[PDB]
C-alpha cells in the first residue's frame, strides 16, 4: 500500500516474483478550436497521458470517445500536458492565442492549419547603457 492506502503492489500466489499495480490510463480531453465562424478543423489535447497509450485503441467500441479516423490524424506532439493530436509543432515563436500549458500556445496560421508553438514573451531589446550617457525625450 501507500500514503492513500490503495492496493498498488501484490505478490502472485504462484512463484515469489513481485508485481506493481498502477491504474489504467485516464485523463480529460480538451479541444483546441478556432471559431466556427472561422474554419471548422480542430485539434485535440489528451491531458496528462503518455502518447504511446492512445494509438493502440484505434478500433471500434473501445473508448469513451467514439471517433476512429481522428486518432490517425495529424502529427502528434508530446507536450508537458499530454500530447496534442491534430496540430503541428512550429519552431519560431509568436504571442499566445489559445493557451495549452507549459509554454505551448496554439493558433491558426497559414493551406491554413492549426499550429502549436512556444510563447514569445516580447520583443527583445538591449538598452544602450553607459556610465556617461543619458536619454531625454524631446
Ligand X SMILES: *[C@@H]1O[C@H](CO)[C@@H](O[C@@H]2O[C@H](CO)[C@@H](O)[C@H](O)[C@H]2NC(C)=O)[C@H](O)[C@H]1NC(C)=O
Ligand Y SMILES: *[C@@H]1O[C@H](CO)[C@@H](O)[C@H](O)[C@H]1NC(C)=O
Binding site for other proteins (CB under 8 A): 2-6, 23, 26-38, 40, 42, 44-45, 47-48, 64-67, 70, 80-81, 96-103, 105, 108, 119, 121-138
C-alpha to C-alpha distance for 103 and 119, rounded to whole angstroms = 5
Smallest separation, CB 18 to ligand X (Å): 14
State the binding partner of 91 from other proteins, ligand Y, ligand X, none, CB within 5 to 8 A by kind: ligand Y
The residue among 31, 33, 53, 51 whose CA lies nearest residue 41 is 33
The residue among 80, 90, 91 whose CA lies nearest residue 51 is 80
Nearer to other proteins, 111 or 125 (CB): 125
C-alpha to C-alpha distance for 103 and 57, rounded to whole angstroms = 29
C-alpha to C-alpha distance for 117 and 120, rounded to whole angstroms = 9
Residue 36 as a binder of ligand X (CB under 6 A): the answer is: no
Footprint of ligand Y (CB under 6 A)? 37, 50, 52, 91, 131-132
Amino acid at each position: 500500500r501507500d500514503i492513500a492506502d490503495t492496493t498498488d503492489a501484490v505478490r502472485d500466489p504462484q512463484t515469489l516474483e513481485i508485481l506493481d499495480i498502477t491504474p489504467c490510463s485516464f485523463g480529460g480531453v480538451s479541444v483546441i478550436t478556432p471559431g466556427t465562424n472561422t474554419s471548422n478543423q480542430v485539434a485535440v489535447l489528451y491531458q496528462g497521458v503518455n502518447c504511446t497509450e492512445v494509438p493502440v485503441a484505434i478500433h471500434a467500441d473501445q473508448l469513451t470517445p467514439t471517433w476512429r479516423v481522428y486518432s490517425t490524424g495529424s502529427n502528434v506532439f508530446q507536450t508537458r500536458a499530454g500530447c496534442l493530436i491534430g496540430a503541428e509543432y512550429v519552431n519560431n515563436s509568436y504571442e499566445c492565442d489559445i493557451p495549452i500549458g507549459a509554454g505551448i500556445c496554439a493558433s491558426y496560421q497559414t493551406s491554413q492549419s492549426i499550429i502549436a508553438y512556444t510563447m514569445s514573451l516580447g520583443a527583445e531589446n538591449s538598452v544602450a547603457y553607459s556610465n556617461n550617457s543619458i536619454a531625454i525625450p524631446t
